[PDB]
């Protein structure tokens, strides 16, 4: 005997401050791979609709959430890594994809979760000015770990000889700039990419689109949704003091039991609504049909 | 018997390979053709 939920409570964060996404893709100068930037987007609504309007991305892949669900979802911390690479390196930015040269510069965590974005920078980064200010490390005595950037530039002791300051045969300079060309072939155009690390750890969600905050209701099991927590149970205040940190709770069966609301700082107690079991006590149908 | 039942519950808190352990946090992340494989993992595990 399963009681279906009545309505669909939704409770997303309060404000509707647009997230500064126009200065992520559409920006002037993108630092090279040997030193990329960290863009911490914090406590804002991010309407991905314009990120569906602004649709000029050549390659778009993510390994965590799906873009179908990116709209009706939330995140707690977001970080973006904007830079530029070769035309043949746009396929190298993928978790576990061992780069012939793309591990020295930028590696992706195999545990990644978030959508990477790439689009052709031929009209902005390939000009007559040579644009040799785009650089990338070519070799190093060790391969980097995913979210670490070796912005250092030292001499390389190739051939096992101390080439202290001098660049000679097998003493090369690692930070070799990009051999870009204004309006070169397809394989060699400068590609402008940007990743997004959606930290989906269960913490108070900040960066997500707006959805209709419906008023709380007690003792009525409803198809609620707290930042993706699509639970369908009754609601009540919880006696036990929740944590001043994250808004989510757990139990032995990893099915949330008590939460705290995004907007109001009131404690909630979740419980799947009345569940029992029918048992059709029947005499033989050859004798009746009443059960 | 009580301990058998008590160890049957704690199998709901097992990833079994999937990127979560609860079926509301797989359909709130992935899409049908891509969440179906995760749920296939979880369901063959829980059925086992």
């Amino acid at each position: 005997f399963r009681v279906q939920p009545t309505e669909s409570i939704v409770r997303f964060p309060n404000i509707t401050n647009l997230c500064p996404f126009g200065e992520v893709f559409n920006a002037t100068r993108f630092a090279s791979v040997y030193a990329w930037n960290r863009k911490r987007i914090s406590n804002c609504v991010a309407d991905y609709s314009v990120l569906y309007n602004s649709a000029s991305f050549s390659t778009f892949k993510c390994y965590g959430v799906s873009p179908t669900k990116l709209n009706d979802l939330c995140f707690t911390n977001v970080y973006a890594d904007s830079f530029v690479i070769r035309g043949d390196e746009v396929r190298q930015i993928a978790p576990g994809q061992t780069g012939k040269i793309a591990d020295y510069n930028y590696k992706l965590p195999d545990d990644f979760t978030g959508c990477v974005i790439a689009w052709n920078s031929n009209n902005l980064d390939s000009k007559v000015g040579g644009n040799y200010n785009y650089l990338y490390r070519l070799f190093r005595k060790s391969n980097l770990k995913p979210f670490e950037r070796d912005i250092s530039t030292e001499i390389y002791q190739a051939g096992s000889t101390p080439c202290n300051g001098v660049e000679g045969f097998n003493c090369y300079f690692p930070l070799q700039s990009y051999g870009f060309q204004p309006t070169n072939g397809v394989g060699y155009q400068p590609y402008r990419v940007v990743v997004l690390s959606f930290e989906l750890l269960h913490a108070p969600a900040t960066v997500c689109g707006p959805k209709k905050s419906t008023n709380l209701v007690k003792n009525k099991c409803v198809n609620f949704n707290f930042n993706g927590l699509t639970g369908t149970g009754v609601l009540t205040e919880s006696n036990k003091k929740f944590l001043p940190f994250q808004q989510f709770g757990r139990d032995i069966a990893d099915t949330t039991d008590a939460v705290r609301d995004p907007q109001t700082l009131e404690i909630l107690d979740i419980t799947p609504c009345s569940f029992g079991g029918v048992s059709v006590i029947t005499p033989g149908t050859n004798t009746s049909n009443q059960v | 018997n009580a301990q058998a039942l008590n160890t049957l519950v704690k199998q709901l808190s097992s990833n079994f390979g999937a990127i979560s352990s609860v079926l509301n946090d797989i359909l709130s992340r992935l899409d049908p053709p891509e969440a179906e494989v995760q749920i296939d993992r979880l369901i063959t595990g829980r059925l086992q």
């Binding site: 139990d251 032995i252 069966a253 099915t255 419980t271 799947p272 569940f275 | 009580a2 039942l5 008590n6 519950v9 709901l12």
Partner: peptide, 30 residues
């Protein structure tokens, strides 16, 4: 006959040393 259930003196010394929330979790998970 003192008890409502017609147990005995020695049956009572038994129904106390076994004793047979968690049951709510099991009830909710089916």
């Amino acid at each position: 006959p003192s008890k409502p259930s017609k147990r005995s003196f020695i049956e009572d010394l038994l129904f106390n040393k076994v004793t047979l929330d968690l049951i709510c979790a099991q009830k909710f998970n089916g």
